[PDB]
């Protein structure tokens, strides 16, 4: 699977966004854009996440 680690907290701006906290491990599901990817959190919730806020895991 493709996983990333949150480098900073992200509160989410649009309703499609996936809010997260620094340290969270997220799984990448799709990359419809270069800097915005769809990911899933440890609870199974899905949403868009900003690439600059994460590092590869």
């Amino acid at each position: 699977a493709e996983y990333v680690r949150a480098l900073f907290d992200f509160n989410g701006n649009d309703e499609e966004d996936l809010p997260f906290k620094k340290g969270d491990i997220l799984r990448i599901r799709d990359k419809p854009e270069e800097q915005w990817w769809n990911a899933e959190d440890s609870e199974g919730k899905r949403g868009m996440i900003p690439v600059p806020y994460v590092e590869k895991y």
Binding site: L7, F8, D9, F10, N13, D14, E33, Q35, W36, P50, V51, P52, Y53
Partner: peptide, 8 residues
């Protein structure tokens, strides 16, 4: 935190 990138 870093700048949140624009959407397209």
């Amino acid at each position: 935190p870093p700048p949140v990138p624009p959407r397209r």
